[PDB]
Design a protein around this ligand. Structure first.
Ligand code: HEM
Ligand SMILES: O=C(O)[C@H](Cc1ccccc1)NC(=O)[C@@H]1CCCCN1C(=O)CCC1CCCCC1
Length: 453
C-alpha cells in the first residue's frame, strides 16, 4: 500500500512542519489525520512515523530493527558523546558501559540511593511548608529543582543546591542552552547562514562549561580516593565482565552529562504531569492521598514503604501514557523487510515511534483514550505486548527506569501525605517542548496538613 505523507513546501519537502514551538504535538495531529504510518521527507532525509501498536510491535523486534540516532540525538552527541544514550549499539563503548552500569540501576540498587533521594524530597516538602498563605508553587520549576538535585547527589555526590537559587547552577545554564541549540537546529533551513554564527559560538562555549565542570568532578574524585554510594565511584572502579575493560575518563564524563540530561526535565516532567492530572481529577487525588496517608506512617519514608504505594505507581504510569516526557525514539532496518505485511523497507530505512500516539491506540486502550484512569494499570499483565513504551524498547530501553520511578513514587507520595492541593487558577494545559515535554506555567497552592517530618 502507498504510504500517506503530510503537506509539502516545494523543495523543502515536509521540513517546515517542524518549524514550530511544538513539533511532537504537530506530529500527533498529523498522525490523527493520516493514521498509523506516514512518510516524512526533508532535504537529504526520509523517515516514517509509526503510531499503532500493530506496526510498533514489529518495529520493536530487535532481530529486524535497531536503535537509530535521530537528527536530534546526533546533535545531542556533540556534548553527550558516546554515552549510553547517544551511542550506536555496535560501538564498543555502548555494550561496555551497558554491562558496567546495569547493576547500578537495578531495583535492588535503589535501596542504596533511597537515603539521598529522601534528602532532596525533604528539601522540597520543607520549601512548600515554608510558603506564606498567599503564595503559590511553580510546579515544573520545583520538580526540576528536585530531579536534577537527586541525580547530582545519587550520581556523583555533587550538590547543585537548586532549592537555594533562583539562577540555575552554571552547568545547568550551559546544558539547557546546548539542548535548546540542538532542538533549534532541526528546524533550520540553511544551517550555515551567517545569522546562526552567534548560535554556534555559544554552543562551543557551553560544551566547554559542561566538560570543565564534569572533568573536574571526575579528577577531584580520582585525586581523593574517597568511595561513595554513587555511580561515579562504580564507574571509576568497575570492569566490564565481557571485555575486562573499565570506562575511560572521557566516556565517564559523557555518561555523567547523559544522566544529568535525563534527570533534568525528562524526569521532572513526569511529576509535573502527574500533579496536573491529580488536581484535574479529584477522585483520583482522593485515592492517591488516602494511600499515601495509610502507607507513609513514618516521618522518613522507607524503601519498603515506597514499594507499597501501588496506586501512586498507577497514577505515574497513567501520566506516562498520556504525556510520555521522552516522546519519540528512532529505529533502522537491519535488513530488507516488510512492515505489517504492507510496507517494504530497504536495509538502512528509518522509522520514528511517536509514543504519545501509540498510547492513544483505541484498538488497545478503548475509545476513552483521553481520560485519566489509573485503573488501566491495576494489573500490568492486562496490557498487550508492546502497547506501552514510555521507557523505549529492548536492550536500548531506558537504563534509568527504576531510578526515575522510585524517585517519582517517593516524591509524589510525600507530596500527597503532607499537603492538600488546589488548582486555584483553573490552569489550562499548555505543553512546552524542549528535548522533553512539560506543562508550562502550571501553578497550584499547597495547604499544609501540618504533619511533622
Ligand atoms: C520518566 C523519566 C524518563 C523517561 C520517560 C525516560 C525515557 C527514555 C527512553 C524513551 C529511552 C530510549 C531512548 C531511545 O531509544 O532513543 C531512554 C534511554 C535512556 N535513559 Fe531514560 N528516561 C527517563 C529517565 C532517565 C533517568 C533518570 C536516567 C538516568 C539517571 C536515564 C538514562 C537513560 C539512558 C542512559 C538511556 C540510554 C540507554 C541505552 O541505550 O543504553 N533516563 N530513556
Ligand atoms: O530528530 C529527528 O530526526 C526527528 C525530527 C526530524 C528532523 C529532520 C528530518 C526529519 C525528522 N525527531 C523527531 O521526530 C522527534 C519528535 C519531535 C522532536 C524531536 N524528536 C525527537 O525524537 C527528539 C529526540 C529525543 C531526545 C530525548 C528523548 C526524547 C526526544
Amino acid at each position: 500500500k502507498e504510504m500517506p505523507q503530510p503537506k509539502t513546501f516545494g523543495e523543502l519537502k515536509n521540513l517546515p512542519l517542524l518549524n514550530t514551538d511544538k513539533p511532537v504535538q504537530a506530529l500527533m495531529k498529523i498522525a490523527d489525520e493520516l493514521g498509523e504510518i506516514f512518510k516524512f521527507e526533508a532535504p537529504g532525509r526520509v523517515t516514517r512515523y509509526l503510531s499503532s501498536q500493530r506496526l510498533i510491535k514489529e518495529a520493536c523486534d530487535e532481530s529486524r530493527f535497531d536503535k537509530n540516532l535521530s537528527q536530534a540525538l546526533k546533535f545531542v552527541r556533540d556534548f553527550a558523546g558516546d554515552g549510553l544514550f547517544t551511542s550506536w549499539t555496535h560501538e564498543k563503548n555502548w555494550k561496555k558501559a551497558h554491562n558496567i552500569l546495569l547493576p547500578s540501576f537495578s531495583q535492588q540498587a535503589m535501596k542504596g540511593y533511597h537515603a539521598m533521594m529522601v534528602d532532596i524530597a525533604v528539601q522540597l516538602v520543607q520549601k512548600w511548608e515554608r510558603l506564606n498563605a498567599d503564595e503559590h508553587i511553580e510546579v515544573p520549576e520545583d520538580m526540576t529543582r528536585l530531579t536534577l538535585d537527586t541525580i547530582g547527589l545519587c550520581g556523583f555526590n555533587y550538590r547543585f543546591n537548586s532549592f537555594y537559587r533562583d539562577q540555575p547552577h552554571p552547568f545547568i545554564t550551559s546544558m539547557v542552552r546546548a539542548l535548546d541549540e540542538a532542538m533549534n537546529k532541526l528546524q533550520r533551513a540553511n544551517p550555515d547562514d551567517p545569522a546562526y554564527d552567534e548560535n554556534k559560538r555559544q554552543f562551543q562555549e557551553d560544551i566547554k562549561v559542561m566538560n570543565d565542570l564534569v572533568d573536574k568532578i571526575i579528577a577531584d574524585r580520582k585525586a581523593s580516593g574517597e568511595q561513595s554510594d554513587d555511580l561515579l565511584t562504580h564507574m571509576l572502579n568497575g570492569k566490564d565482565p565481557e571485555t575486562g575493560e573499565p570506562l575511560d575518563d572521557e566516556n565517564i564524563r559523557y555518561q555523567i552529562i547523559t544522566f544529568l540530561i535525563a534527570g533534568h526535565e525528562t524526569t521532572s516532567g513526569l511529576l509535573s504531569f502527574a500533579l496536573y492530572f491529580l488536581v484535574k481529577n479529584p477522585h483520583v487525588l482522593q485515592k492517591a492521598a488516602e494511600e499515601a496517608a495509610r502507607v507513609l506512617v513514618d516521618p522518613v519514608p522507607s524503601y519498603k514503604q515506597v514499594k507499597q504505594l501501588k496506586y501512586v505507581g498507577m497514577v505515574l504510569n497513567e501520566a506516562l501514557r498520556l504525556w510520555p516526557t521522552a516522546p519519540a525514539f528512532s529505529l533502522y532496518a537491519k535488513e530488507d523487510t516488510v512492515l505489517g505485511g504492507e510496507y517494504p523497507l530497504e536495509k538502512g530505512d528509518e522509522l520514528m515511534v511517536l509514543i504519545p500516539q501509540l498510547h492513544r491506540d483505541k484498538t488497545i486502550w478503548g475509545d476513552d483514550v483521553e481520560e485519566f484512569r489509573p485503573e488501566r494499570f491495576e494489573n500490568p499483565s492486562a496490557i498487550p505486548q508492546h502497547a506501552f513504551k514510555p521507557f523505549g524498547n529492548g536492550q536500548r530501553a531506558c537504563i534509568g527506569q527504576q531510578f526515575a520511578l522510585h524517585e517519582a513514587t517517593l516524591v509524589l507520595g510525600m507530596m500527597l501525605k503532607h499537603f492538600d492541593f488546589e488548582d486555584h487558577t483553573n490552569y489550562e494545559l499548555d505543553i512546552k517542548e524542549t528535548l522533553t515535554l512539560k506543562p508550562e506555567g502550571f501553578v497550584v497552592k499547597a495547604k499544609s496538613k501540618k504533619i511533622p517530618l
